[PDB]
Design an enzyme around this catalytic site. Structure first.
Site, PDB file in Angstrom:
ATOM      1  N   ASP A 124       0.854  -1.171   0.000  1.00 39.70           N
ATOM      2  CA  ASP A 124       0.000   0.000   0.000  1.00 39.70           C
ATOM      3  C   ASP A 124       0.895   1.226   0.000  1.00 39.70           C
ATOM      4  O   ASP A 124       1.394   1.618   1.046  1.00 39.70           O
ATOM      5  CB  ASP A 124      -0.912  -0.008   1.234  1.00 39.70           C
TER       6      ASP A 124
HETATM    7  N1  LIG Z   1       4.532   0.382  -0.863  1.00 40.66           N
HETATM    8  C1  LIG Z   1       4.522  -0.103   0.552  1.00 40.66           C
HETATM    9  O1  LIG Z   1       3.576  -0.772   0.960  1.00 40.66           O
HETATM   10  C2  LIG Z   1       5.692   0.265   1.496  1.00 40.66           C
HETATM   11  C3  LIG Z   1       5.636  -0.024   2.824  1.00 40.66           C
HETATM   12  C4  LIG Z   1       6.666   0.314   3.672  1.00 40.66           C
HETATM   13  C5  LIG Z   1       7.793   0.958   3.168  1.00 40.66           C
HETATM   14  N2  LIG Z   1       7.838   1.247   1.850  1.00 40.66           N
HETATM   15  C6  LIG Z   1       8.996   1.909   1.356  1.00 40.66           C
HETATM   16  O2  LIG Z   1      10.242   1.045   1.916  1.00 40.66           O
HETATM   17  C7  LIG Z   1      11.249   1.865   1.828  1.00 40.66           C
HETATM   18  C8  LIG Z   1      12.223   1.701   3.060  1.00 40.66           C
HETATM   19  O3  LIG Z   1      11.532   1.669   4.275  1.00 40.66           O
HETATM   20  P1  LIG Z   1      11.618   3.047   5.251  1.00 40.66           P
HETATM   21  O4  LIG Z   1      11.047   4.232   4.504  1.00 40.66           O
HETATM   22  O5  LIG Z   1      10.876   2.729   6.530  1.00 40.66           O
HETATM   23  O6  LIG Z   1      13.177   3.502   5.638  1.00 40.66           O
HETATM   24  P2  LIG Z   1      14.261   2.669   6.534  1.00 40.66           P
HETATM   25  O7  LIG Z   1      14.517   3.505   7.701  1.00 40.66           O
HETATM   26  O8  LIG Z   1      13.775   1.251   6.894  1.00 40.66           O
HETATM   27  O9  LIG Z   1      15.603   2.553   5.672  1.00 40.66           O
HETATM   28  C9  LIG Z   1      15.574   1.748   4.511  1.00 40.66           C
HETATM   29  C10 LIG Z   1      17.040   1.585   4.080  1.00 40.66           C
HETATM   30  O10 LIG Z   1      17.523   2.714   3.571  1.00 40.66           O
HETATM   31  C11 LIG Z   1      18.851   3.055   4.422  1.00 40.66           C
HETATM   32  N3  LIG Z   1      19.103   4.508   4.438  1.00 40.66           N
HETATM   33  C12 LIG Z   1      18.425   5.452   5.114  1.00 40.66           C
HETATM   34  N4  LIG Z   1      18.985   6.647   4.852  1.00 40.66           N
HETATM   35  C13 LIG Z   1      20.025   6.442   4.004  1.00 40.66           C
HETATM   36  C14 LIG Z   1      20.937   7.311   3.415  1.00 40.66           C
HETATM   37  N5  LIG Z   1      20.931   8.736   3.629  1.00 40.66           N
HETATM   38  N6  LIG Z   1      21.876   6.836   2.610  1.00 40.66           N
HETATM   39  C15 LIG Z   1      21.941   5.508   2.367  1.00 40.66           C
HETATM   40  N7  LIG Z   1      21.042   4.653   2.935  1.00 40.66           N
HETATM   41  C16 LIG Z   1      20.094   5.124   3.751  1.00 40.66           C
HETATM   42  C17 LIG Z   1      18.580   2.608   5.626  1.00 40.66           C
HETATM   43  O11 LIG Z   1      19.836   2.276   6.372  1.00 40.66           O
HETATM   44  C18 LIG Z   1      17.863   1.282   5.347  1.00 40.66           C
HETATM   45  O12 LIG Z   1      18.792   0.349   5.061  1.00 40.66           O
HETATM   46  C19 LIG Z   1      10.636   3.300   1.705  1.00 40.66           C
HETATM   47  O13 LIG Z   1      10.845   3.809   0.451  1.00 40.66           O
HETATM   48  C20 LIG Z   1       9.136   3.055   1.962  1.00 40.66           C
HETATM   49  O14 LIG Z   1       8.295   4.140   1.403  1.00 40.66           O
HETATM   50  C21 LIG Z   1       6.828   0.916   0.988  1.00 40.66           C
END
Ligand SMILES: NC(=O)c1ccc[n+]([C@@H]2O[C@H](COP(=O)([O-])OP(=O)(O)OC[C@H]3O[C@@H](n4cnc5c(N)ncnc54)[C@H](O)[C@@H]3O)[C@@H](O)[C@H]2O)c1
Ligand SMILES: NC(=O)c1ccc[n+]([C@@H]2O[C@H](COP(=O)([O-])OP(=O)(O)OC[C@H]3O[C@@H](n4cnc5c(N)ncnc54)[C@H](O)[C@@H]3O)[C@@H](O)[C@H]2O)c1
Lengths: 436, 435
Positions: A124
Site C-alpha cells: 500500500d
Molecule cells: N509500498 C509499501 O507498501 C511500502 C511499505 C513500507 C515501506 N515502503 C517503502 O520502503 C522503503 C524503506 O523503508 P523506510 O522508509 O521505513 O526507511 P528505513 O529507515 O527502513 O531505511 C531503509 C534503508 O535505507 C537506508 N538509508 C536510510 N537513509 C540512508 C541514506 N541517507 N543513505 C543511504 N542509505 C540510507 C537505511 O539504512 C535502510 O537500510 C521506503 O521507500 C518506503 O516508502 C513501501
C-alpha cells in the site's frame, strides 16, 4: 544485467532473494549501515557499497551510471536524488513508494531521458492498485461500470500475537502513521463527499469490520480516497472509500496517546518517561509515581487507556530514547517494546468490495480477499507483499517486458498482469466472490 | 534405508516430502486406491504398490520383510494386521493413532521380536502428548508438582475463511465430531469431578476463549479429561481439563441440528432435504413458509434457522443415500463446507499449568502453538499430523531411539528431538510463565 539496490532495510532481503534466483543479475547494494550490508552479503552474492546518499550524492551519481537498473528502498524523501542520477545517466528505476509532487515535477525529463521509472509498487501502495485495476478493467471489458469501491488494508500481527494493549506489533518506526491520526479523512459515500476530523474525535469514525467472524477487526478511513476516481478511472462511482484495518481497541489505545500530547512534534525537554510525562500533564516533573498516575487518568479517566500506558512503561523510571521530538522518542520506545521477535508471525489482510453495474442492469457485488501470514523460517507477509512486486517489476524491466516509457505507477495490465500472476507462486494468493 | 508407507491419504504427502529430503531413503507406498498412489508417484520418487491389507495379508508379509521400517497411515483399525507382519518379520513400525487395546495386545510379542512400534504420533494424539510431557518432565525434574492442567486444541479454518453459519470447514468426515456433541464430558476441577451431559444442554458448557484479543474463539470440554492423570503421571493435580476450540457461534449452530434431531443414527425414511426435514418436525410437504415457521418452533432462535436454509436443509436438494439421518448430514456438510484449493486451515493449541515448586511458589505456564495451512503446500492439519510421524520414522532409521516395545512419544528420547525439529519447519510453540 547490473542492478543497484539502494537501501538495506529488511524490505531488501526478499528482493535480493528473488533477483538472485537465476544468477544472471549482478547485484550491488548501497546504504549507510555497513552492518546491514555485511549480513546481507553472507546470504547473497552482492557488491557492497557504503554510502550516505544524502551527503555523497556525487559518488551516488558515479555508482548509478554503472547500472542497468536502480531499485530505491530508501526512505522516500531520497527518491528524488536517486531519480536525478538515473535521469542524467539514462538508467531505469523502480521504487515502492508514493510518487510525490517532488518526483512528479521531473516527469518530463524522464520521458526526455527515455528511461522507465515505476513507483508505487509494494503493498500500500502497490498490490492495492493492482487488485483494483485488475477488476476495474475486467468490468470495462464487459461494458460494466463501477458504482462503488470500498477497499480496506492493514498489516497486523498474526492473531496469536495480538495480546498486548495496542493489539499491534511494529514492523518499522511508526513515526509516520502515528501522526496521521491527527488528520482529517475524506471519502465519497452515496454521491456526497464526506469529511471526518482527526485528533480526539477520530475514534468516532473507527468502525467494526465484520468480514470474518473469527477475527476482531476495526477499520477507519484513510486520508483521501476521493483521489481514486481520477487515479483508477471510476468517475461514475457514487462511493469511494479506502481504509485501514486493525484489531479492535488499537485506535482507542492511540486515542489516549493523543489526549496526553504524545503525538506531538515538539522537542524533548538523565530523562525518564515519568519525567517526560510529568512535563506533559502540567504535574511536573519529579513527583511520586502514584501522583503522576492520578494525573494521567485525569485526562480520561479511562482505565484501559491508562493500562496501556503503564504496560509500555511510560509512567516508569525507564529512560526516554534519544530523539529530536516526543513522537520520535515514543516511536523508538514502541519499537523497543512491540517489535516482532525472531519467531513471531505477522499478517496482511486486504478486502476489496466493488459494485459493478452491468449494461443488462444487473448489479454485481464483487469482493476480493487477500490474506497472508509470515513464515518464521522465511520472509514476513509484509516483506513478501512490499518487496516482491517491487522485485518482480525490476526483473520485468530487465527481461524487457515493460515497453511503456516515462514516470508511471503500476496501473497498466502490462505491469499488474504479470506481477499478480507470479506472486501466486510466492504464496500471495487472493480469492474472489460475486453475487447479483 | 528402505521404508514402506502403508496408505496414500493426504497425511502421506507431508510424510513422503519429509523422508524424500536426503535422497538416501527408498520409499515404497501401498494402498487400495491406485489413483492416489499414481499422483504421489508424480511428485515423489516412490515404488507404487497396489494392495488391500485385508485381502493380501501374504503379499503384506513379503513387502514388510524387505523394509527397514513400516509407517502405517491406514485407518487405525487395520494397524494390528500391519503389526503382525512386523512382529513376524522383525521390522520396526510407527503409526499416528491411539494405541488401542487390540494393538496393546501384541505388546509382548513386540518385545519378543525386539522391534520398536511407536504409536500416538501426530496432532491428537501426538503433539498434545509431547508438549504436555515436555513441560511436566521439566517441572518434575526440579522437584515441582503439577497442580493444574488445562489444555485446549482445535483444527479450524484460518479466520479469513470463517464466514459461514458454522464458522467451520471440514478437513474430513464430521461424523465423529457431530456425534461427540451427544456424548457427555467428564473432567476434574478444584478437586471435584465435573459431569456435563450431551445433547441439547451441552451448549451451556460452551465458554469464551479469550487468549487472543484478535481471535473469536469458544471452547468446551472433551469426552474424557480425567484419564490424562494416568497418561501423564499427574494424579497430583486438582484440575484436569482438555477441550476443543472453535469459532464463536459454532456450537450454537450445531445446537440447532440437535434440536431438529439431525444428529441421529437411525435410518433415513426421491427424497429431498425439505421432505426429510418435514418428517423431523409436518410432512411431506408442503409449503416452505410453513416449514420455516415450524422449524422456528424448535427454538425459537432464528439464527439457528439461518444456518439451516443456508445449508439447503429446507430446500429441494436431494438427501444423500446413507444408513442414517446423521451421516447424511455429514455428507451434506462435506459437499457444502469442504476446503477449496485456495483456502487456509489452522491449528490452535494452548496448554496451561499449574506448577508448584519445592520453594512453595506457584508458576503459571502457558504453551501456545499455532499453525496455518499453505495454499502452495500442505494444510496445517496435514503438517502437524504427518511431520511428527515422519520425524520419528527418520529417528528410528538413523538409530536415535533405543527404546523397544510398544510405546507412545512420552519419553524425552522421542518427544525431545521431534519438538526441536518441528520448530525448524516453521511450526513454533512458545512458553510463558508468571507468578
Ligand atoms: N509500498 C509499501 O507498501 C511500502 C511499505 C513500507 C515501506 N515502503 C517503502 O520502503 C522503503 C524503506 O523503508 P523506510 O522508509 O521505513 O526507511 P528505513 O529507515 O527502513 O531505511 C531503509 C534503508 O535505507 C537506508 N538509508 C536510510 N537513509 C540512508 C541514506 N541517507 N543513505 C543511504 N542509505 C540510507 C537505511 O539504512 C535502510 O537500510 C521506503 O521507500 C518506503 O516508502 C513501501
Ligand atoms: N494423531 C492424529 O492427530 C491424526 C489425525 C488424523 C488422522 N490420523 C490417522 O491417519 C490415518 C489415515 O487417516 P484417515 O483414516 O482419516 O483417512 P483414510 O481412512 O482414507 O486412510 C488413508 C489411506 O488408507 C487407505 N486404505 C484404507 N483401507 C485400506 C485397505 N484395506 N487397504 C489398503 N489401503 C487402505 C486408503 O485408501 C487411504 O489411502 C488414520 O489412522 C488416523 O488415525 C491421525
Amino acid at each position: 544485467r547490473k542492478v543497484l539496490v539502494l537501501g538495506s532495510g529488511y524490505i531488501s532481503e526478499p528482493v535480493l532473494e528473488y533477483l538472485s534466483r537465476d544468477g544472471n543479475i549482478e547485484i550491488t547494494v548501497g546504504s549507510d549501515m555497513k552492518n546491514q550490508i555485511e549480513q546481507l552479503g553472507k546470504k547473497y552474492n552482492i557488491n557492497p557499497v557504503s554510502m550516505d546518499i544524502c551527503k555523497q550524492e556525487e559518488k551516488l551519481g558515479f555508482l548509478v551510471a554503472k547500472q542497468d537498473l536502480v531499485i530505491s528502498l530508501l526512505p522516500y524523501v531520497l527518491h528524488p536524488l536517486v531519480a536525478k542520477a538515473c535521469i542524467t545517466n539514462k538508467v531505469n528505476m523502480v521504487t515502492a513508494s508514493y510518487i510525490t509532487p517532488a518526483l512528479k515535477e521531473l516527469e518530463k525529463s524522464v520521458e526526455d531521458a527515455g528511461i522507465t521509472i515505476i513507483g508505487e509498487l509494494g503493498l500500500d501502495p502497490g498490490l492495492d492498485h493492482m487488485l483494483a485495476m485488475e477488476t476495474i478493467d475486467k468490468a470495462k471489458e464487459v461494458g460494466a461500470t463501477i458504482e462503488s469501491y470500498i477497499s480496506y488494508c492493514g498489516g497486523l500481527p498474526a492473531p496469536e500475537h495480538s495480546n498486548n494493549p495496542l493489539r499491534y506489533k511494529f514492523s518499522w518506526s511508526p513515526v509516520g502513521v502515528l501522526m496521521n491520526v491527527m488528520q482529517s479523512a475524506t471519502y465519497l459515500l452515496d454521491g456526497k463527499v464526506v469529511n471526518v476530523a482527526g485528533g480526539i474525535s477520530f475514534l468516532d469514525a473507527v468502525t467494526s469490520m465484520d468480514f470474518f467472524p473469527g477475527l476482531n477487526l476495526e477499520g477507519y478511513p484513510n486520508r483521501d480516497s476521493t483521489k481514486y476516481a481520477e487515479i483508477y478511472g471510476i468517475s461514475s462511482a457514487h462511493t469511494l472509500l479506502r481504509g485501514t484495518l486493525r484489531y479492535k481497541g488499537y485506535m482507542k489505545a492511540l486515542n489516549g496517546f493523543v489526549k496526553l500530547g504524545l503525538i506531538n512534534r515538539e522537542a524533548l525537554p538523565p530523562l525518564t518517561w515519568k519525567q517526560l510525562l510529568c512535563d506533559l500533564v502540567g504535574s511536573p516533573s519529579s513527583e511520586h509515581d502514584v501522583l503522576k498516575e492520578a494525573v494521567l487518568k485525569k485526562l480520561g479517566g479511562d482505565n484501559t487507556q491508562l493500562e496501556a500506558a503503564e504496560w509500555l512503561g511510560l509512567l516508569g523510571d525507564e529512560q526516554v530514547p534519544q530523539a529530536e521530538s516526543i513522537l520520535d522518542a515514543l516511536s523508538k520506545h514502541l519499537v523497543m517494546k512491540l517489535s516482532y521477535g525472531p519467531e513471531e508471525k505477522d499478517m496482511i489482510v486486504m478486502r476489496d468490495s466493488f459494485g459493478i453495474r452491468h449494461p443488462s442492469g444487473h448489479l454485481e457485488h464483487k469482493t476480493i480477499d487477500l490474506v497472508a501470514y509470515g513464515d518464521i523460517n522465511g520472509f514476513s507477509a509484509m516483506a513478501k507483499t512490499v518487496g516482491l512486486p517491487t522485485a518482480m517489476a525490476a526483473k520485468m524491466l530487465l527481461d524487457g517486458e515493460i515497453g511503456a516509457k516515462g514516470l508511471m505507477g503500476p496501473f497498466s495490465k502490462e505491469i499488474y498482469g504479470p506481477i499478480l500472476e507470479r506472486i501466486k507462486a510466492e504464496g500471495i494468493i487472493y480469492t474472489t466472490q460475486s453475487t447479483i
